[PDB]
Design a binder for this molecule. Structure first.
Ligand SMILES: OC[C@H]1O[C@@H](O)[C@H](O)[C@@H](O)[C@@H]1O
Ligand SMILES: OC[C@H]1O[C@@H](O)[C@H](O)[C@@H](O)[C@@H]1O
Ligand SMILES: [K+]
Ligand SMILES: [K+]
Lengths: 822, 822
């Protein structure tokens, strides 16, 4: 059961019906201006920050879902329809939506008129451009009137949705029917006061009519599907004063048989300097100069086409760093196109704004943006470098950090909680990934403030020291790191004990004292603490490095001595020192996070995959047996069936959802990587397939959400909805699966001084070639892979055998030809 | 131009079409459980607190407005319609909605089936009850299936609308088709964890089927008007897991011509003790005991009719304290029914939850609840006493207060700002009003904490001292009170200077220093500081009262020496010491608030209304000429046409709306009362009529909002929407207009030791009788009123002349007969 198909050649997912299981969206824009666009044109646009500068209005939990967005009502003979199907839902002769890289096309045809709209955000522009092609597909001349529609948001999305007592009186527009390139509407709410920015909605023709008042265009008592103006066949030329500003133009079109016409529409974000805000001395008329400029940049079809081609070439360049050619077209399209595109989206969006995240409370996460860098550093390392400096600037002098920052201002806030004790080490992970990818050791000398405070700058390396020493100096009675509010699992809140509803577990005040410790953070510390030691060694700091490796040794030993339950790693100790994630308890016996992470860190790894005695093997067998399902690995088993006061939010989910028995996808890749470490390629690859979009496309009707991107959660076996996803697009799962597949399964992974080539994928991919650009050289990596259990590669480079699996980095302009035998 | 009419005998407003200019609501409930109910059954319900315990979901800014509520879909041979008209919008043969005191009835008829629903919140119950009567009005048998529908909210409304990434997995329900009185659905989201409460939706018959999943009931791609289940003609028996829980039952009914059937539905809020939360040892099944009991209390039509009659008698009793019989039926319906009913609603809701206030950021206001007490103390003095203690408990030791408190917890917060310097004086105003009404001097001895701190309790009188002294100790260079963040006008922010958007002026950090002073607070202190001085003397604190009288006299002199512009009172001095509200500036020349309040306080009052040299008369004449429009008096003139950085939020509204040139109705009765003080009854009554619902009913298409309640703002003459109101129901306009008409125009006003009888209403009301119950005796006050300017009453009581206009309070069970000659 499928609603579409992948088009690899066009780098598109083609949706062949309006009637998907749920709205399926694309993101347009990769720089500072973003649009969410569903396959029914639903969604919204924002500049830098979805909460603070949201241009256009979108209703979450609408009835029906996704009724609202960028509509073009066609009136042909009194019949009104939209090519996006919603909101009018007229029967279409033909419908198709293609979601591509930074653009989508939606096409609807009815009664001899085909209307195709290309939507995209052009490079270097803070604007969503639409090119509409209307074609007369009948054998007689046709006429119709097209009515564009977008509903503006009053910038601050939180105020827009809750502060009507003020905001129904502040909506302001200007209307310019006869501008330099066509007609434009300006949405300028609050430009009278503190905003130096306004929006424009314009078209490259002189429109017959316009409307700026929603209530007049739609009509009293009517939904969008029943809009009065398009049914009457004539705009009302409404000029809004408060209430609900919109942008709408009417355009009369006439077409000979087989003839088409292109219209270009632009939604743009403009700023003026304070000294030039106004066209008039009375300060009532906005200075339209930047809007006129933008509209002249997209005044013709040739301009749109040229910008769409520049975007296509930009994607080709971005995707040229890592690619694979294998026997498996599903694996290839993920590695080559979709997983990398999704890593761009998560880099830009963090967990802020999707069709599930509402673009209000959540900004750029400290943990989330570090995990995202893992899968992003090969794509645009300069932008990764800058994101590291932004993130690190929100860290405090003691090594702890704001959990997230406001994207518009880059200042940290406590809006979704504070004191998550895994956050500091994630900074080490992101910088080490960055340095291995780029060889830019100089980033460690970059001056970086604490909490953006002028004069507080220290080199970025010293921030890593603060992160490292935060964990060293905050260990509990077993020598494991204190958990604080929660670790990577936000719902494991051991210092909470809340019995009173009203406040989120993520923000509620926690109690001081206790001895709550995390095995997860212990594993994270052994893994990334070893990276910090290497960075210190490279900087000549022999005493810092030696001491660092000693602490890493103590914590590893603490995990084996006090974090081991017998057949799997313990999860935590609670506030009173009682173990969590032990077979001694009836529920929450085994939790996935320490099994994946401890083994990734090398803890408990013995002689080989068939060392029965090794703790890593026992842990992974337990995972397989107790957490394994056909849709992936659940977070813990059994789920909790009653509220456990001492554990916080985790048991408040019904069993099989989110952190209580859900398949929490971000943790799956840790087990996939763990299995490659022990030498079980076939098992690692099997788990990759269970959660990976291209492999789940055939069950589109079960997964429900986009078949082309990872989601945060799939409902687990304990859920009546087992198999169904929530929270698509915005998840650490995108970066960490990209890591897993590109670096551990396919095995091509940068290290500080060379490229490790260490395939561990099992027999289902018996040969493949990776082309990898690293440190200015191209490595063509040809793999013959028996998939024999535990077998690891030997290499020949440019015809000479080499020792080991690391190819020392070659000087730039090389093609290095690596032949791999597994 | 009208959409209904008043029915005085039934104490109802009758809306005779679905097609009003805006949804027109009623409030059900007077105690702890409340429903907002539109004339199309739209709205929602909550227990105590609209933010934290919202039982049912409502979308503000829905398209169309108010699509969502308590619906009853009728399927009659495949034809589907709702008697509320929305959401199906099928053509109705007859439609009527009647909004009454605590209940509403909505009736719709189509093709021989009439469906009438009575909605109400019964006394002493946390439930909304609907009694539905279906009548076959045709000449042949009918069969129809009735589908009830309500959509649940996940309690925390803020979370409900923003936190889908969590809350789409937590919705949980139980279904009980075979309960003790009929069928019921339980909505129990988070009852698993910290919540001790759940909602029930039940009907008093064994239903044919049920639905609890919205998406199954409504159908993919469908709006509520197109819901699949009612169109199919049978329930889907859906059991929700996450997503959107609803309550729906189906009942097939068969009726002979003329036959009717009653069905009783209940939406109830239930709590269990922690120890009795669960029916079963495993804690998986909710204890239904309180829901079964509730459903048993409304299992019959007779039980509903009894509760409805008890609610009618409760309102007859509440309205027996003050009533008027005159020759003006518009005046009498406002005084006897609608204004008192509104004051009950504002007492209960403050500014929290309406069709404009979103029941999220706003709780119970310190200023707001004190102003509302002014019009409520005579209705239920025992509840007003309790509210005073609740408010005063959120005051700090230095006399300043939290600006509002959370209704569920009664604890103050800064969610809409802090340091509004008019706040502390309002407490004195509320307590003086209460003691005058009740003679309950012992309230001053009640122990009241500061900021709810156990152990911090001082007598309530000492809180008034802290109020009084905060003003004394915070006056500026001219002897006028420092303004702080704002005074009563929340948009006058003289300490703000914000040039960067992103944060509300109400919450944004303010600048220390400057000399900004408020003439409004000066007046407020003269008026209420004088009451404090009286209270101090009555408490035996002679020297404290002598000191208080002296400070009142200082501030009074300062208003005339430094707060007088020439022809009207100044508004403020800004942060720099420059006057605000002076004829020296081009915009904002004259502000309404100090003209009304300074003259209420007696400042500038001369020999009589024809003393053209008295500053009060000059000021009121400038008000009439500069601020007076046919819709009421605007806040200031001219409105600001550009942003004035030193004045904060005010100039951010486009001219003619809200605080920038809007008719801000709460300030009008200050001018009405001021005009009675100077002896111009005719002009006072004129201003009362310009804004009063019964007088504006004849321009319902202009006003747009409910024609039976005051609104916060009517757009002013500078707006294109001149005459159109926003923010109905929840405004201090209701209490202050009640004070103006009952106590100053009709002239019947409690004082500490007697009842003042001082009519000042002009010639349009030449005879009337007030019946007033005060301090346990009833006063029958018969007024013969020439309305000649400046003529004041003389009284005879029980046949004997009295001196002056104060009738000393008679002992209980008197009928005191007062004859009044003006
Ligand atoms: O916070 C509440 C306040 O918000 C301001 O924007 C409005 O202008 C005021 O009228 C309102 O009282
Ligand atoms: O604040 C964000 C956190 O909210 C919690 O309610 C969810 O369970 C987490 O998955 C999420 O990461
Ligand atoms: K997480
Ligand atoms: K106010």
């Amino acid at each position: 059961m499928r609603y579409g198909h992948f088009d690899d050649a066009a780098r598109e997912y083609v949706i062949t019906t309006p009637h998907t299981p749920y709205p399926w969206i694309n993101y347009l824009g990769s720089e500072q201006f973003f649009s969410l666009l569903s396959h029914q044109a639903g969604g919204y646009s924002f500049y830098r920050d979805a909460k603070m500068r949201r241009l256009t209005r979108y209703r979450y939990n609408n009835i029906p879902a996704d009724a609202g967005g960028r509509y073009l009502y066609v009136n042909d003979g009194g019949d009104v329809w939209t090519p996006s199907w919603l909101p009018v839902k007229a029967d279409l002769d033909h419908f198709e939506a293609r979601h591509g890289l930074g653009y989508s096309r939606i096409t609807g045809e009815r009664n001899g008129l085909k209307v195709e709209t290309l939507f995209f955000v052009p490079l270097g522009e803070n604007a969503e451009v639409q090119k509409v092609t209307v074609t007369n597909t009948s054998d007689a001349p046709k006429t119709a009137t097209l009515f564009s529609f977008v509903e503006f948001c009053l910038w601050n999305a939180q105020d827009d949705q809750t502060n009507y007592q003020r905001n129904l009186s502040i909506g302001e527009v200007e209307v310019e029917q006869d501008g330099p390139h066509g007609s434009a509407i300006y949405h300028k709410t609050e430009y009278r006061e503190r905003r130096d920015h306004y929006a424009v909605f314009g078209v490259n023709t002189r429109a017959d009519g316009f409307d700026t008042d929603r209530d007049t265009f739609v009509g009293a008592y009517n939904s969008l599907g029943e809009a009065s103006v398009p049914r009457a066949g004539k705009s009302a030329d409404s000029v809004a004063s408060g209430w609900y500003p919109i942008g709408s133009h009417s355009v009369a079109v006439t077409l000979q048989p087989g003839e088409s016409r292109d219209l270009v529409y632009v939604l743009g974000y403009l700023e003026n300097p304070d000294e030039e805000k106004w066209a008039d001395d009375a300060h009532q008329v906005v200075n339209k100069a930047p809007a006129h400029a933008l509209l002249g940049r997209f005044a013709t079809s040739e301009q749109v086409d040229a910008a769409l081609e520049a975007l296509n070439s930009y994607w080709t360049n971005l995707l040229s760093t890592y690619s694979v050619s294998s026997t498996d077209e599903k694996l290839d399209r993920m590695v080559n196109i979709w997983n990398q595109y999704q890593c761009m989206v998560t880099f830009n969006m963090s967990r802020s704004a999707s069709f599930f995240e509402t673009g209000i409370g959540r900004g750029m996460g400290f943990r989330d943006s570090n995990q995202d860098l893992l899968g992003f550093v090969h794509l645009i390392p300069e932008r990764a470098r800058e994101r590291i400096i932004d993130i690190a600037s929100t860290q405090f002098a003691d090594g702890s950090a704001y959990h997230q920052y406001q994207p518009l201002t880059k200042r940290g806030n406590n809006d979704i909680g504070s004191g998550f004790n895994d956050d500091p080490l994630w900074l080490i992970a992101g910088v080490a990934a960055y340095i291995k990818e780029s060889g830019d050791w100089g980033i460690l000398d970059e001056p970086v403030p604490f909490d953006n405070e002028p004069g507080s700058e220290v080199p970025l390396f010293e921030h890593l020291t603060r992160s490292f020493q935060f964990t060293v100096q905050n260990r509990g009675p077993h020598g494991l790191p204190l958990i604080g509010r929660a670790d990577w699992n936000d719902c494991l809140n051991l210092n909470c004990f809340s019995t009173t509803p009203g406040e989120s577990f993520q923000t509620i005040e926690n109690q001081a004292g206790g001895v709550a410790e995390s095995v997860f953070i212990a594993a994270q510390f052994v893994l990334y603490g070893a990276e910090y030691a290497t960075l210190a060694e490279r900087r000549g700091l022999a005493d810092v490095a030696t001491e660092a490796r000693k602490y890493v040794d103590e914590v590893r030993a603490a995990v084996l001595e006090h974090g081991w339950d017998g057949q799997w790693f313990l999860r935590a100790y609670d506030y009173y020192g009682n173990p969590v994630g032990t077979d001694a308890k009836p529920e929450g016996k085994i939790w996935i996070e320490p099994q994946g992470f401890a083994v990734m860190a090398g803890i408990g790894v013995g002689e080989g995959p068939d060392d029965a005695d090794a703790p890593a093997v026992k842990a992974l067998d337990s995972v397989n047996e107790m957490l394994g399902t056909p849709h992936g690995l659940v977070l813990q088993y059994p789920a909790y069936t009653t509220y456990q006061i001492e554990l916080g939010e985790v048991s408040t989910y019904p069993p099989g959802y989110k952190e209580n028995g859900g398949i929490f996808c971000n943790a799956n890749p840790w087990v996939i990587i763990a299995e490659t470490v022990v030498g079980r390629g076939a098992q690692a690859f099997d788990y990759y397939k269970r959660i990976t979009p291209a492999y789940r496309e055939d069950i589109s009707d079960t997964h429900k959400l986009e078949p082309y991107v990872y989601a945060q959660m799939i409902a687990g076996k304990e859920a009546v909805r087992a198999g169904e996803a929530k929270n698509s697009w915005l998840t650490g799962t995108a970066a960490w699966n990209f890591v897993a597949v590109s670096q551990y399964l396919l095995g091509v992974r940068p290290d500080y001084d060379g490229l490790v080539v260490d395939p561990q994928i099992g027999p289902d991919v018996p040969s493949y070639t990776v082309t990898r650009v690293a440190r200015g050289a191209t490595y063509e990596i040809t793999v013959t892979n028996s998939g024999a259990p535990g077998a690891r590669a030997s290499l020949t480079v440019d015809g000479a055998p080499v020792d080991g699996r690391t190819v020392p980095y070659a000087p730039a302009g090389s093609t290095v030809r690596v032949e791999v035998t597994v």
